Every structure is written in C-alpha cells, then in structure tokens.
Amino acid sequence: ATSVNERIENKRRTALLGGGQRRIDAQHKRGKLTARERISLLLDPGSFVESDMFVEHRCADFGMAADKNKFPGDSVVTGRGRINGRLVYVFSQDFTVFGGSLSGAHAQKICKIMDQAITVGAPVIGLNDSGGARIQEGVESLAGYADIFLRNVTASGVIPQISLIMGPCAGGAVYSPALTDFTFMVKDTSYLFITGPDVVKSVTNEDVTQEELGGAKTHTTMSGVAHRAFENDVDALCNLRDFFNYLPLSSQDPAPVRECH
Amino acid sequence: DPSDRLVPELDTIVPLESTKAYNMVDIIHSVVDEREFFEIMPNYAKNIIVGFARMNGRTVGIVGNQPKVASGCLDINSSVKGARFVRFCDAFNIPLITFVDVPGFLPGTAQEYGGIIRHGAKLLYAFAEATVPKVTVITRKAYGGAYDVMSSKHLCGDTNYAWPTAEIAVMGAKGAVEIIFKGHENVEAAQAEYIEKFANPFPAAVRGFVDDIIQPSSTRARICCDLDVLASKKVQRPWRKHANIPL
Amino acid sequence: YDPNEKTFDKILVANRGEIACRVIRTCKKMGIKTVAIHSDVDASSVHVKMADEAVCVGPAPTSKSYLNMDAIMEAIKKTRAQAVHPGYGFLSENKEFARCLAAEDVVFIGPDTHAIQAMGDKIESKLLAKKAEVNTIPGFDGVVKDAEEAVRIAREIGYPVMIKASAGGGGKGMRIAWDDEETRDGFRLSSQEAASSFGDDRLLIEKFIDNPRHIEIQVLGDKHGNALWLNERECSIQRRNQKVVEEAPSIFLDAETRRAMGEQAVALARAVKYSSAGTVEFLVDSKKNFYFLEMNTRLQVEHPVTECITGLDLVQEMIRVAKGYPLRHKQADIRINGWAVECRVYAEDPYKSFGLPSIGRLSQYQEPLHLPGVRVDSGIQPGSDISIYYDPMISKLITYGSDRTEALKRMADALDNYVIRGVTHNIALLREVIINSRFVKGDISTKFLSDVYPDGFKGHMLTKSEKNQLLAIASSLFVAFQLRAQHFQENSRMPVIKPDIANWELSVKLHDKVHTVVASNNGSVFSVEVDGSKLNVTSTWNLASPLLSVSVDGTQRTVQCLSREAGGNMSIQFLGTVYKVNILTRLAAELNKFMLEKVTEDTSSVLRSPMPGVVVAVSVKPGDAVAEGQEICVIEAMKMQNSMTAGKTGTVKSVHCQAGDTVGEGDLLVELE
Ligand SMILES: CCC(=O)SCCNC(=O)CCNC(=O)[C@H](O)C(C)(C)COP(=O)(O)OP(=O)(O)OC[C@H]1O[C@@H](n2cnc3c(N)ncnc32)[C@H](O)[C@@H]1OP(=O)(O)O
Ligand SMILES: Nc1ncnc2c1ncn2[C@@H]1O[C@H](COP(=O)(O)OP(=O)(O)NP(=O)(O)O)[C@@H](O)[C@H]1O
Ligand SMILES: *C(=O)CCCC[C@@H]1SC[C@@H]2NC(=O)N[C@@H]21
C-alpha cells in the first residue's frame, strides 16, 4: 500500500481550489473572476492541455519553509489550446496565491511556455494580474523579470503577443505588457502604475487616488499605453477571441483568408 | 596610453554615506583614454550621460547615470536619449560600456500621465536587443526594475562587475522592513539585520549575477581586457523582417 | 637607525597632514607601533591608512575634532598609548594639554610646561632675554596706556617705531607710524583692534628695524643640561607674514656671527631650561646687528631643510630625549654639508593678493622622485580632497646639492617636473622667485615680495627667444596631434589614401598678437620658422604622458598640455606659467575674420533655484563680499542634499532664501554675480 495516489488527488484539489475559499469569496466580492475559468472561457471547450501543474517554489527564507506558505502551481496557470481550430499558447496569473507575485517557478513556467511557442510558431496570450515582484525572494524575482523581458524582446516580430490586464499590476511587471504588440484593459478593475499613491504622497506631497493615477480611463484616453477598454471580463474575452481571429499565426504565414459573401 | 594604467583616484570617489551625490563624468574621464570624452546632448536630460570615447584605440559607447541631477532617477526624456544612442551604437558595431547608479524611476503625476512606461520599455528593449559586446559596472546603487533595464546579466550581457560600495536590492530597506515584518511591529532591530545581510553586493554575487567584486582602481584594465577578448562575438537570432519597437 | 636600544612601544600622533606621515615614518624606521587619529572627513587620508590602528575623534570642524581634549583622552585610554606626539600647531603649545597628559601616566613629546608658560607671552619673553644678556631690540619697557606715554617714549627712540599688539600674533597687530599725530591715531587704532583680536588689550612699543633679514636658528636640548645649535636658517621670502621659500645655509652671515648667534641661543635655552627641540628667531639688519625676537616651543615646519645639511634626524633625537637618553653628539660634531633650498606648495591662487585659499579634488598627482637630490614630504595622494576647515598645505619640496647654484637648478627642474591637476597651486610663483636676479645674488629681505611686484604677481615675463621657443613647441605639438589623427587600421575594403602635404602653414595667437608659423615634418624632427627665425623641435612625441620633454635647438625643455580643444584653444604650462594659445590654419584664420563678436553681458544677477528642493540651511550671512573659498547654502531634495556652490566671485546684494526655506525651481535665492 502506497500513499502516492491520494497525494495526487490532494495536490490536484489544492491546485484547483487555489489558495483558499475565503480569498476566492473576496475575489468574487469585487466582481473579479478566477484564472482557470478565464482560460475555460477564452479557449474552445475540451481542448486545453495544462502543463507544469505540480511546480512549487523553492524559497527557504523568511519562514516559507513551513507548509502554510506552500502552494502548488505558484499562482500561474499555463498550457496550450485552440481557438476556432488554430493552436495558441496562453498563461494566466492567480491573484489568490501571494497576490500573484512572481517568483522563480512563475517565471520558469512562463519562459518554458514562451520557448515552446516560439519553437512551434504559435501566438502567445497573457492575462496579467500580479501585485509585483515577490519581495522576500530578492534578486530571484529580478532575474525572472529580466528573463521574461528577454524572451518578450526576442519573440517580437516573429509571433503575435497579446496582453489583457484584469487587475492591479504594479512594480516591474508593467514592462512586460508594454513590450507586447497590443494591450487591453478592463474598466473599474484594472490598474497599471509603477509606484503607489502612498509613495507619491511621501515624495511630491500631492493628493492623488489610485483610480486617477492608473485607471483604465487614464491609460486609454490621453496616455496612449492601452489600446482598448472593456467594462467586464466575459465581453473582454469574447472581443479578444474575435480580435485573435484576425491575426496570423506567425510572420512566415500570409494574412488569413476567410469565406466572403 | 597603456591599457593597464591604474586609476587609484576612484578608490574614494564614492562617498561612504548613501545620501551624498557625485559626478560620474569624473569617472568617465578617469577610465577612457587620454581623458577625452565627446558628450552627446550635455544640456538635455542631465540625469543620464551618453557620448563617444576610445579604449585602447577602439571607439566605444558610454552610458551612465548622473546622481548629481535628480538623484539619477530615470525619466521620460533620459529613456529615449539613452535608447536612441544605444540603438545607433548597435547598428554600426560599437561596443557599449555601462555605469549603473540608479534608485529607480522618477515618481509623480506628470511622469505617469505622460507615459513613463512606454519610454522605460523603449530603453529596456534597446538594451535587451543588443548584440555588440557590453560591459557593465555597478558603482553604488541598483534598485527595482531599473537594474534589469540597465543591461543586467540576464539580458544576454557579457561581463558585469560591482564595486565594494555597490549593492543590489529589490527596493528600499525601510519599505522592505515595513512591508515584510508588518505583524512584528518592531523595526528597531529588524532594520539592522536587514541592512546587515542585504545592503551589500553579496546576495547577487553568490547567485552568479555578477562575475567578481573588483577594486575601483582596476576598472580600466578589466574593461580593456574584456573588450579585447570579446571582439569576436557572434550571436544568432530567429529570422524576421523587423521587430516591434514600442515607439 | 639602531634598534637594539629599547624605546617606547606605541606612539600616538595627534595631528594631521604631512607631519603625521613624517612622524609615522620615523617611528616605523625605529620599529615602534604607531597609533593615529582622524576626523570623519579624513577617513581616507594617507596618514590614517599608513598607520596601523585608527581612532575617530569627532566631526569635520577643527574645534571639535583635533581641539577636543576628551576625545583624545579616551583615545589614549583605549589605545594604552605610552607616548603622544602633537606635531606643530593645534595643541602643540597649549600648556593644559601638556600638564594633563603628564599627570596620570603619559609622557608628552615636547617642552615642559614651565618653558612653554615662560616663552608663551611676548612681554615676559623679552624680559627673560634681557636677563639672559642677549641682544634685543630697543623699545619701551612696560605696557603703554595712552598716546601721551607713547609720544614721550617716541621722543627718545625716534619716529621709526612700531606699535605691537602684546600677546596673540599671527602676523597681525603691528602698525607703522612716523608722526606724533600718526602715533596717537595708530595707538587708538591698536587699542581698538586689540579687543577684536584677542581682548588682552596690552600694547607694546618697540623700535622698527628697516630692511631686516629673518635669520632662523635651530636648537636642541635634553634633560641632562646639554644644548646644540644645528646651524642656522633663513626665512625672508614671506607674504602675509608666512614663509614660502626657505634656505638652510645663510649666505649673508660669516662664521663669527653664526657662532655668536648660536652661543646666544644656547645660553637662552639653558636659562629657559629647554629640554626638547626648539627654535629661536632673530632679526639682522644691514650692519650685521642681530636682535632676539620670539622663541617657538615646538617643532618647526622647516626642520627637513636643516636636516639635509647635517644628516641628523630631528624626530629620532627628540623621541630619544623624551625617553631620557642623552645626546650622542657634541658642538664640534656638527658641520655644514652642502646647500639646501625648500619651497612650500600651497593650494592657493598666486594671482590674487599673493595667495587666496582654494578648494577642489585632485585628479592627478605625481612627484619627481626620480630626479637627483629631490626629497618630497607630502601628505596627499591622488583622489584626495582639499577642504575649508584646515590648512591648504599640499606638499614640501626639498632639494640639496654641493652649492647654491646646483641646488637651485635641481629645484627648478623638480618644480618643472611636478604634476598637480584639479586644484590651483602656487608653483608658478615659487619657480619665478628662485630665478630672480636679486635672489640669485643674495640681496633679499622680509619685504622682497612687496617691492619686486608692486602691482602684484603677474607671471613669467618671457623674452623674444623664449617666446619663439614656446611658439615652436605649440606648433610642433599641434602638428603632431594632427598627424597622429590620420593613423587608422587596415580595412581591406576601402584603402586609405593619406594626404601628402609637406609644409603646415599656421597662425598662432598669443596674448594679443598673431604670429605666422611654418612647420615641416621630417620624421621625429620638426622644422619651424617663426617670422624668419628658424628652430628645430625634436622629441619622442608621446601624446598620452602628462609630462613631455622636447629639445629646442639643443636646449632641453619640459612642457605640459593641460587642456586641448578641437576649436584650436590650447593651454600649455611653459616654464611654470600657464600660457593660453589659439592655433588655426591660414585658411581658418582668414575665414574667422567674418565672424561677428559674440557679446555675453547677460544679467547674472537673479539666482533662480536650480531645483524645487527646500533650502535646509544657509551657512553664509546676508551681505557677504567673499570672493571664493566658501559655498552658499545646501538644498534638500529627494532624500538628497545638493549644494549650489559657486567658484565665481558673487557679491551678495541681498539674501532672499534663509535656513529652512521652501523654494521652487526658478525662484531667486541670493543676489549674486
Ligand atoms: C522590480 C520592481 C520592484 O522592486 S516592486 C517593490 C514592491 N513595491 C510595492 O509597492 C508593493 C507592490 N504592491 C502594490 O503596490 C499594491 O499592493 C498593489 C499592487 C496595488 C495591490 O493592490 P491590492 O489589491 O490592494 O493588494 P491587497 O491589499 O489585496 O494584498 C493582498 C496580498 O497581496 C500580496 N502582495 C501584493 N504585492 C506583493 C508583492 N510585491 N510581493 C509579495 N506579495 C504581495 C500581499 O502579501 C497580500 O497578502 P496578504 O493577504 O496581506 O497576506
Ligand atoms: N621691531 C620690529 N621691527 C621691524 N619689523 C618687525 C618688528 N617686529 C616684528 N616685525 C615684523 O612682523 C613680523 C613678525 O613676525 P613673527 O615674529 O613671526 O610673528 P608670529 O605670529 O608670532 N610668528 P609665529 O607665532 O612663529 O607663527 C615680521 O615680518 C617682522 O619683520
Ligand atoms: C527611501 O528610502 C525610499 C522611499 C522612496 C522610494 C523612491 S521613489 C523612486 C524610486 N523608485 C523606487 O521604487 N524607490 C525609490
């Protein structure tokens, strides 16, 4: 008798249920969805293959050596699927686990997915929702950010890249959507800034709130960082599918041709 | 001009306290041959330094920060000013030499309303796309994503060095202490241990993110020998008509 | 340098600069552990790293770092130092320091408290000298209380009489009068200024000596009652009553007068019971008459130059005396061996009032240690900084030789072969003094600098031949740079076709004149024709070394290229002085006549705030006419303090920004120029 089977079920249920039911309820309280159902809505049903499900972070400092600070998946869901029959690679970030802060495993999974996509020659779609770099990791988060930036720069002009912010993205994670071809946001729930309002108050001594500092309207009306805005997530995902129906799979293929009437 | 000339004057140019400012143009004059430096745009966006110089007779590109102006923080103008020069040096096979002293990006409402993200991405892309050999030296400061934007090791950099007074950290010691040990509500000692173990270049050195920690007086010799070695660099990239600059 | 004899094991050096380095050298050569102190600023000095342990003493100002008694007290207690060395200045004269050190267990390297107390005041010193049957300047006895006393005394001593401020000193408080009404107004002025200077208000009347020579006498004593006079010295070239050029052997005096002065100094030292190294100063007139004036109870700054002529180590002997051993020499064991000349290098501008303090950071620093018979005593290294709280002292250059002429030539060569970049120095003045005809002949006095340059120092007046040499050297260097610019590497795709120009026609502008120069290259030899005159300039033509030696018509010259610009401007240091030239081709010179003269009158009155940072403090006082050597204020911004320091003379018409004043960028701070 081996307990290596019930362990698989426990790990799978922990990955599917995220970081707790209370955090999921808080997420739904603000009218914001979860990563797995986002991926299910975006991709065709029955065609999503998940990879790197059992990956865990290797931090051993500031008390995360205990079990209470250990979560499989590490606040990111990656895999491949099909949209209207055409292959695509997609990654989504989970705000439930450590606020979506990026760590070694998170960046490693993204880098592996991007490497597979550039090798095969398929587009990349990213749903960005992260609180920034993991503060306790140290230089590891900086290394992950730099590697992701390098892979974003390398793949530019070879395969299309799309970013879709659904939550508060701050810190150094804001430079990855800026290096992609197109950027979209969601009204009243998505934010994009480098420094928080508290730092603004501390430094320049001028009163400002988060919404006017990094809201969807600010970046979509007179800032030129985002391309379009959507009121909620389902309509945003439907429009993202419609837009992806336009783009070719790679720079080596001609513009798509569809039946006309 | 000998390539192994020592520069003992740099052993104390960096103040021991972290609140004082200094001139990077002095260091640039110290390192380059015959102390000749053709500065580009000297009166525009004075928080960054770009220009043309020679090392062992070979033309090189110089990029660095100016802590005397705006504490060396990056802003909208300096981003494009450095990015265009880096791209031009890339286009014609000119090596790049980098001096890093940055605490982050300039904050406020004007920079965010004006689109600081696009120009930061401009500079980051200009450094990441580089194929010519690059040597980077860290003098005092490297905080946040500015360290990655400033030609870190993970952007296909060649060699990186750090002075003994340098240090690499995610963000400020005070902020890190107040955001990590929130429940403990005791920052009297925690700050002391945090600055004792992380306010030094050792966490980056032990991970291999920087090659060695060198004395400031051997910077010219190290850069000269590295540039001589790295003259035959060739790197291949996937085919494409052109890439997408974030302009 | 015998180490067999047992001496102290640890020594403390409570000073800074070159003297600390010399003391550390002397103790290291004797195999003695050394202890050093330093302020917060001087944490990277040569003397703090050249020693072994270091003990901070306090902040930057000298009132709290080197004059702070308690800090030194715990320094000795922690280091368990068996001895202490004051150097010169600072606490080398304060008697309370000596007594408190000698109280518990610590020996003080210096004179006893009684001797310092005796020769610490100008009134008792002259009385003791008169009791010591040594010659003294005739003058009034006692302190004059009113101008009536002064004038009646002036009846029997004459008009050339100088009213002197009793005690204090520092080259101030001496006023010259020649008339009864002049006497009374000078007495009133001295009485008024005595309170401002020191507050003692005691006044001294003494006969002025016209055209005096300052002859310097060195004496050494012990605790066993033995005194030696180590020849003499002459310190006559002074500005602001401070010596700059010193000569160890005196050319004025003969053996008889030297012996008489030495015997008088030894007798005075015996009367005072001096038991350390000390000095006695005399004034000698034209008629070979000498009078006593002041005794310094400390180590003299001019000790190395009198060590060169005798081969004796003053610090070693003084340390041994402090231990208790008697002297190993006799008065018949001291002889004069050759000649020695010493000049003092200052971080000051010799173009304004014979010297004005300056600040900066040294980028290049090299000493001519490879030249024959050159000794350098410097407490500076490349990368060092010159502050405002201390002496602008840089280095002491000492040369020796078989006679006066060889020593002077060697010192001139060393001055020409000395590299300092970053701060302005007085090397030009020092090199100009030693080549003067009067100084070479030997007719100098305390007022030598006040009459040879009535309008102040202007530089080196170069003759026609020297002007031609300078023009030829500048043209040769310009053509050498132009020729070096054309040496590229092989490309194998587009070969380079070098131009075949033969003769270079140039136009050189020096001062307010234009000279036509024709230059030709024949390998490593240049043929230059300057207005008909023909000269040949040859050298190795190294364009990277700071020092370049050239041969102009056989004569060997050393030049330095301080600055060079593509516009034709060039700064070259020739014969010590810095000359600015403008070199252009004939076509460029002809075309430059069509350029309108650019006028830059500007306003330069309102000093708008460079950045929105808040002015944390304003060190200066409203309404200041200070030219240089001082900053204005410090501005705090973005966790950083930035200072709008100005090296330009800006008159303060009015101060608009005070301490703790918030100002945005573009706001007038202080009305300056
Ligand atoms: C490379 C660039 C850098 O060096 S960035 C340095 C970090 N500077 C910062 O200001 C911290 C970044 N975080 C933020 O700015 C804000 O929290 C933002 C991103 C706006 C999040 O908004 P908000 O929805 O209100 O967060 P929250 O109050 O719900 O917090 C919930 C959990 O999220 C986590 N979180 C957040 N950021 C990080 C981070 N950088 N690293 C690790 N964890 C992070 C928090 O730990 C928090 O957890 P908990 O539930 O309070 O226990
Ligand atoms: N009776 C006098 N007659 C003519 N000149 C005098 C007379 N007394 C002083 N002087 C001049 O004033 C200056 C005195 O200098 P000095 O005796 O060194 O003062 P000091 O400040 O006590 N020196 P020191 O303490 O050793 O640094 C000299 O230049 C003298 O020429
Ligand atoms: C002081 O110790 C640090 C607090 C101020 C933060 C400043 S603001 C701009 C720089 N960017 C960053 O992330 N920290 C720096």
Ligand SMILES: [Mg+2]
């Ligand atoms: Mg005197």
